[PDB]
TrEMBL record:
Ca(2+) 6 binds at residues 348, 350, 352, 365, 367, 370. Transmembrane segments: none annotated. Its cofactor is Ca(2+). This is mannuronan 5-epimerase. Ca(2+) 1 binds at residues 66-67, 104. It comes from Azotobacter chroococcum NCIMB 8003.
Length: 480
C-alpha cells in the first residue's frame, strides 16, 4: 500500500536528519511484503553510516519510493559529511534485492559542503561472484552534485530500467552501467558531469540505450568499454536515437566490445571525434547525423581502429571486425578501417579513408575525394582453382576525384597484368571493371579489385597510387 515518511517522523525541512525516518518507512513497507514509500515535497537531509557500503538509505525488495516530482522532493546529503558514501539510495551488498525502484525525486550529493566519493543510486549484489539484483526501476529521477557517480547501478543487475531521468553536475559520470544485464536506459539526459555522460562497463550485456542525450560532459557523451580489468567484454549494446553533443572528448566511444550498434543519433560539437570505435568485434554504424566534431583538434569525424592491449592487462590485440557503416550523414572525414571477414563500409560527404582489410568487402566513398586503401595483396583476390569470392568491390569509384591506394603492394603501374603491372578489364556484360594481377602467387591467388560499373575508359594512372611517392602526390585525405 502506501507509507508517508512524515508519518514516521521525517521532517523534510532541509535541516533535520531524516535518515532514520525514511528508513523506517522503507522497513515497514518491506515487512508488509512490499509497498510504496511516499514523500511529499520538501528537502530531506540524510547521512551515511559507519561504512561506505552502508550508503545512506537502504531500499529493499518490493519497495518503491515515489516523490512529488523532480526538483520538488529532494533527498540531500547533510552538510559536513566526510566519509566515502556508496549510494545515497542503495540496495544491500550480498543480497539479491528485487522489484524495487525510485520515482519523481531528486538526489543531491551536496559535493560543495561534503568531502569523499559519493554515488547517487547504487544497485547490485557482490563483485566477482554470481548473483544479481533484478527488476529495478528509476523513473523521472534527478541525480545531481554527487562527487562521483550519479546513477551507479552495479554488478550484477538484471532488468534495470532507467527512464525519463537526469544526471547533471556530478563529479565524475552521470550514469554508470556496471555489469548490467538485459537492461534499458531510455529518454534520459546526462549533462555537465565532470567526466562521462553515460559509461557502460564491466561485462554489461544486452543493453538498450534509446533516445538518450548527453552534452557538456568533461569526457565522452557515451562510452562503452571493457574497463581496466582483464574480464569479459561488454556485448550486445544497442544505441538508438538521441544526441551526444558538446562533450570534452568523443561523442560516442566504443572499445573492446562485441556486437555494438549505433543508429539514428545526432552527434555534433564534441572536442574529439564524433564516433570512435576501438577494437570492436561487430559494429553497426547506421543512419547517424555526424557534424562539427573534433572541435579540440583532430582530423576525423569517425574513427575506426584496433585496440592493442598486448602491453596491458589482457595481453591481447583486438581488431575492429565485422563492421557495417551505412546511411550516415558525415560532415567531415571518416576513417573506416576493418579486418578479417566481410565489411560494408560507406563514406559520406567527407574525404574518407576506406580499407576493409582481409576478406571480401564492399566499399563506397560518397561525395568528396576518398582513398580506398589495399594494404596487402591477400586482402582482395581471386583463386581460379575455386571461387571469385574474396574480391572486394568499390561501388562508386569516381575517376579524377577518388584514389586507389596500392602504395604498399609493389606494382609498378597499369599494363598487361604481368611483370608487376595490373590489367584493367571489363567483365562480359560491362557491369564491373577489374584491376587484376594475372600472375598467380605460390598459393594460386591473384590480387584483384572490382570497380562496379564501366570505367575501362575513364580510369587512368593518376587514379591509382602505386608507390609512396605517388601516394604523397595524390593522397586525398589527412588520415595517412
Ligand atoms: Ca543487493
Ligand atoms: Ca567537495
Ligand atoms: Ca574485411
Ligand atoms: Ca566521401
Ligand atoms: Ca568520393
Ligand atoms: Ca578486403
Amino acid at each position: 500500500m502506501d507509507f508517508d515518511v512524515k508519518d514516521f517522523g521525517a521532517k523534510g525541512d532541509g535541516k533535520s536528519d531524516d535518515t532514520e525516518a525514511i528508513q523506517a518507512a522503507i522497513d515497514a513497507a518491506y515487512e508488509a511484503g512490499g509497498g510504496t514509500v511516499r514523500l511529499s515535497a520538501g528537502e530531506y537531509r540524510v547521512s551515511g553510516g559507519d561504512e561506505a557500503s552502508d550508503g545512506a538509505l537502504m531500499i529493499k525488495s518490493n519497495v518503491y519510493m515515489d516523490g512529488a516530482g523532480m526538483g520538488e522532493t529532494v533527498i540531500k546529503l547533510v552538510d559536513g559529511w566526510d566519509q566515502k558514501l556508496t549510494g545515497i539510495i542503495r540496495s544491500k551488498n550480498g543480497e539479491k534485492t528485487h522489484d524495487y525502484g525510485i520515482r519523481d525525486l531528486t538526489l543531491d550529493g551536496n559535493q560543495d559542503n561534503t568531502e569523499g566519493e559519493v554515488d547517487g543510486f547504487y544497485t547490485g549484489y557482490i563483485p566477482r561472484e554470481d548473483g544479481a539484483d533484478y527488476n529495478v526501476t528509476a523513473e523521472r529521477v534527478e541525480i545531481r552534485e554527487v562527487s562521483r557517480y550519479g546513477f551507479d547501478p552495479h554488478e550484477q543487475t538484471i532488468n534495470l530500467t532507467i527512464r525519463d531521468s537526469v544526471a547533471h553536475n556530478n563529479g565524475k559520470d552521470g550514469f554508470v552501467g556496471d555489469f548490467q544485464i538485459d537492461s534499458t536506459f531510455e529518454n534520459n539526459v546526462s549533462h555537465d558531469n565532470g567526466r562521462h555522460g553515460f559509461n557502460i562497463v564491466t561485462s554489461s550485456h544486452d543493453i538498450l540505450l534509446r533516445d538518450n542525450v548527453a552534452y557538456g560532459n568533461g569526457a565522452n557523451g557515451l562510452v562503452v568499454q571493457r574497463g581496466s580489468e582483464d574480464i569479459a567484454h561488454p556485448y550486445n549494446i544497442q544505441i538508438e536515437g538521441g544526441a551526444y553533443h558538446d562533450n570534452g572528448a568523443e561523442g560516442v566511444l566504443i572499445k573492446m566490445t562485441s556486437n555494438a550498434s549505433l543508429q539514428g543519433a545526432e552527434i555534433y560539437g564534441n572536442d574529439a571525434a564524433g564516433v570512435r570505435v576501438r577494437g570492436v568485434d561487430g559494429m553497426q554504424l547506421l543512419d547517424n547525423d555526424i557534424h562539427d566534431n573534433a572541435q579540440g583538434g583532430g582530423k576525423a569525424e569517425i574513427v575506426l581502429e584496433d585496440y592493442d592491449d598486448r602491453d596491458g592487462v589482457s595481453g591481447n590485440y583486438y581488431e575492429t571486425l565485422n563492421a557495417t557503416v551505412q546511411g550516415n550523414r558525415v560532415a567531415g572525414a571518416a576513417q573506416l578501417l576493418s579486418s578479417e571477414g566481410r565489411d560494408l563500409l560507406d563514406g559520406a560527404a567527407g574525404n574518407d579513408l576506406l580499407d576493409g582489410g582481409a576478406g571480401r568487402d564492399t566499399l563506397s566513398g560518397g561525395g568528396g575525394a576518398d582513398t580506398f586503401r589495399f594494404a596487402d595483396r591477400q586482402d582482395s583476390f581471386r583463386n581460379y582453382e575455386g571461387d571469385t569470392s574474396r574480391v572486394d568491390d568499390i561501388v562508386d569509384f569516381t575517376p579524377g576525384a577518388d584514389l586507389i591506394d596500392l602504395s604498399g603492394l609493389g606494382y609498378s603501374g597499369l599494363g598487361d597484368g604481368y611483370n608487376g603491372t595490373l590489367a584493367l578489364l571489363l567483365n562480359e556484360d560491362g557491369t564491373k571493371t577489374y584491376l587484376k594481377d594475372r600472375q598467380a602467387d605460390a598459393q594460386g591467388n591473384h590480387f584483384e579489385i572490382a570497380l562496379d560499373g564501366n570505367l575501362v575508359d575513364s580510369l587512368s594512372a593518376t587514379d591509382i597510387a602505386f608507390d609512396a611517392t605517388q601516394l604523397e602526390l595524390l593522397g586525398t585525405t589527412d588520415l595517412q
